[PDB]
Amino acid sequence: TFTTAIVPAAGLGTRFLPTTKSVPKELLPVVDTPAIELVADEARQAGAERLVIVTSPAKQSIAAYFRPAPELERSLEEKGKTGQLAKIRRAPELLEVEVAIQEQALGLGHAVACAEPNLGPEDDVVAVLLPDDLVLPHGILERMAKVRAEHGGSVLCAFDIPKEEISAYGVFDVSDTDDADVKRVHGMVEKPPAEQAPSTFAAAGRYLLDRAIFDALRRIEPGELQLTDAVALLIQEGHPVHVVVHRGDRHDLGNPGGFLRAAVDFALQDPDYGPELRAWLTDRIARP
Amino acid sequence: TFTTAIVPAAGLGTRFLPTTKSVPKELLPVVDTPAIELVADEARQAGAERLVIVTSPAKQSIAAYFRPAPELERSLEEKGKTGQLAKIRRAPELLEVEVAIQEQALGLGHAVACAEPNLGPEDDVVAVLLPDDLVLPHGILERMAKVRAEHGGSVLCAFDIPKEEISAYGVFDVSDTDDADVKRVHGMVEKPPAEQAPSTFAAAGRYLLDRAIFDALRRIEPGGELQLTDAVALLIQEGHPVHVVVHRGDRHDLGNPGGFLRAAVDFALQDPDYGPELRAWLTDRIARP
Numbered sequence: 001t002f003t004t005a006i007v008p009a010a011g012l013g014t015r016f017l018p019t020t021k022s023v024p025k026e027l028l029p030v031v032d033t034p035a036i037e038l039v040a041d042e043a044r045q046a047g048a049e050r051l052v053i054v055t056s057p058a059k060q061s062i063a064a065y066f067r068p069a070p071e072l073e074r075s076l077e078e079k080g081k082t083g084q085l086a087k088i089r090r091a092p093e094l095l096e097v098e099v100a101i102q103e104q105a106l107g108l109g110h111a112v113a114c115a116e117p118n119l120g121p122e123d124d125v126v127a128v129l130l131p132d133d134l135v136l137p138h139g140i141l142e143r144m145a146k147v148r149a150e151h152g153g154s155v156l157c158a159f160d161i162p163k164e165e166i167s168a169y170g171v172f173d174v175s176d177t178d179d180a181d182v183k184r185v186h187g188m189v190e191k192p193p194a195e196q197a198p199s200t201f202a203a204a205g206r207y208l209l210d211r212a213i214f215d216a217l218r219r220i221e222p223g224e225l226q227l228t229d230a231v232a233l234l235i236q237e238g239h240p241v242h243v244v245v246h247r248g249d250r251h252d253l254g255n256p257g258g259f260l261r262a263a264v265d266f267a268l269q270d271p272d273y274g275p276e277l278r279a280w281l282t283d284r285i286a287r288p
Numbered sequence: 289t290f291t292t293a294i295v296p297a298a299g300l301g302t303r304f305l306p307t308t309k310s311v312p313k314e315l316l317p318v319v320d321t322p323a324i325e326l327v328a329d330e331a332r333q334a335g336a337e338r339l340v341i342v343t344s345p346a347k348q349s350i351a352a353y354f355r356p357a358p359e360l361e362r363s364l365e366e367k368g369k370t371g372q373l374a375k376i377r378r379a380p381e382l383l384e385v386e387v388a389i390q391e392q393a394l395g396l397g398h399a400v401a402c403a404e405p406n407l408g409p410e411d412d413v414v415a416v417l418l419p420d421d422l423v424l425p426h427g428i429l430e431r432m433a434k435v436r437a438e439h440g441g442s443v444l445c446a447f448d449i450p451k452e453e454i455s456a457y458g459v460f461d462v463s464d465t466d467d468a469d470v471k472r473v474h475g476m477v478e479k480p481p482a483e484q485a486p487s488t489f490a491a492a493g494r495y496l497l498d499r500a501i502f503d504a505l506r507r508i509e510p511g512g513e514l515q516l517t518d519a520v521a522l523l524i525q526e527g528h529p530v531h532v533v534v535h536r537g538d539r540h541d542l543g544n545p546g547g548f549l550r551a552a553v554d555f556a557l558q559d560p561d562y563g564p565e566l567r568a569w570l571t572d573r574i575a576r577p
């Protein structure tokens with residue numbers, strides 16, 4: 001399977017201004033843990049050995065997150081904070097992390113293209129994880145790998161969303177396969193009204209891209225490089241593209257509202273917070 | 289009244305690990321805005337002209353937050369994001385900001401004492417705001433300034449907490465004044481059990497300290513930790529007036545992820561961009577594990 005996962009992390013996160021003026025969006029805590037760690041863990045569990053984070057020069061603190069912190073570790077160990085200590089050791093031990101620095105945030109297609117110098121002869125396919133999407137539980141990339149193994153080519157991800165709730169998404173035009181959760185991708189429609197939606201399958205931020213994507217990204221017309229256009233070009237030129245339908249849960253960290261739903265969902269499942277938080281929420285929602 | 293506010297911000301925020309390995313606790317967003325902004329804004333609205341942030345070398349980034357971002361401002365203006373532009377211009381425009389470097393987090397008293405080099409002749413009194421306490425609405429420091437005007441000396445802040453729920457706090461030993469929300473401070477008891485708590489007045493993280501505190505912090509015995517309560521006790525013993533104002537409004541505690549989330553939810557429910565959707569989601573969510 002794939003060994004390299006790419007995380008595009010170039011965008012400011014304008015919905016979290018003013019905080020994202022100074023703090024990388026991908027380091028914001030979900031309860032106590034940054035999304036960059038959550039997606040790094042997902043990638044590792046799907047068998048990534050390497051993570052290529054694409055970011056801006058201002059967001060290099062992301063890199064330092066994945067390096068050991070000797071003094072802090074020694075301090076926690078001396079206080080007997082074994083739980084906090086394990087929690088800080090987790091991210092640095094997940095995988096080999098590299099940062100591809102992109103001077104200007106010019107969109108997702110450009111961010112993926114800037115990862116190409118970090119790839120090697122073994123990278124026939126790369127995983128891509130968008131860090132604003134949490135796809136739960138872990139394992140969507142493993143299902144996508146099964147599809148790559150059977151059909152070759154590239155693999156996308158979809159959420160199954162009713163046509164009347166889908167108009168914020170890219171929506172796949174598809175044909176059936178022998179697996180109910182796997183479709184062949186014919187195209188994508190951006191933000192269709194319900195009556196024009198070609199399917200209930202909404203583009204989700206997980207990919208297994210064949211190396212052919214980099215050539216496709218070089219040959220698309222800018223106007224910012226759209227990854228969808230590069231995928232559309234591959235489909236034109238006969239490259240197989242399938243999509244796996246995620247059936248489980250998801251969170252959207254793209255704006256504070258979605259971010260808070262994720263943090264609350266996770267905090268309610270944690271005994272350090274859950275019971276007291278549940279009691280507080282019960283009363284709080286009964287008043288303005 | 290006071291012109292300099294001091295914000296102690298030297299501690300890691302060990303309860304927010306692993307995030308605070310890389311992100312200063314005081315930059316974490318409440319919905320979209322960091323605590324450091326919320327306390328700078330409070331301080332400005334109480335008439336501060338200057339902010340002295342006490343932090344470690346590794347957390348100097350807090351300072352950059354208070355510098356303009358011309359390129360970002362331009363890009364927001366060109367997209368017609370006038371709301372977002374206003375939101376990023378706010379913190380740099382609030383007041384003059386300085387940082388005092390405290391290589392080691394030796395505590396609150398140490399932090400306050402490391403701010404003294406940033407004071408000038410006109411700083412007879414300083415405000416101190418702990419960024420983990422949000423005291424709502426704005427205005428507690430103005431109430432404390434009234435007390436300083438009447439009695440001189442130094443002024444603390446308390447929440448009114450039942451004795452069955454107060455044992456996590458420092459608790460004041462007090463006497464009455466002619467104002468029901470103003471007490472004379474005799475002393476403080478650290479984390480009393482309910483039956484030993486001398487009052488229901490729990491120490492909150494707002495202060496108006498007379499300059500005398502620095503000398504007191506120089507004369508008290510170190511742990512090299514410098515306990516601020518020991519410096520205030522020394523002043524009390526030496527006849528320096530110390531009163532406390534009882535906050536009657538709301539509060540949030542950003543000291544741990546649980547109280548942080550309560551703050552963020554409380555604020556998001558009042559924000560039309562998020563409130564209605566969030567409230568409907570919460571309604572369903574709390575009805576299941």
Ligand SMILES: [K+]
Pocket residue numbers: 033037086087088090091306
């Ligand atoms: K962790």
Ligand SMILES: [K+]
Pocket residue numbers: 133203204205
């Ligand atoms: K999406």
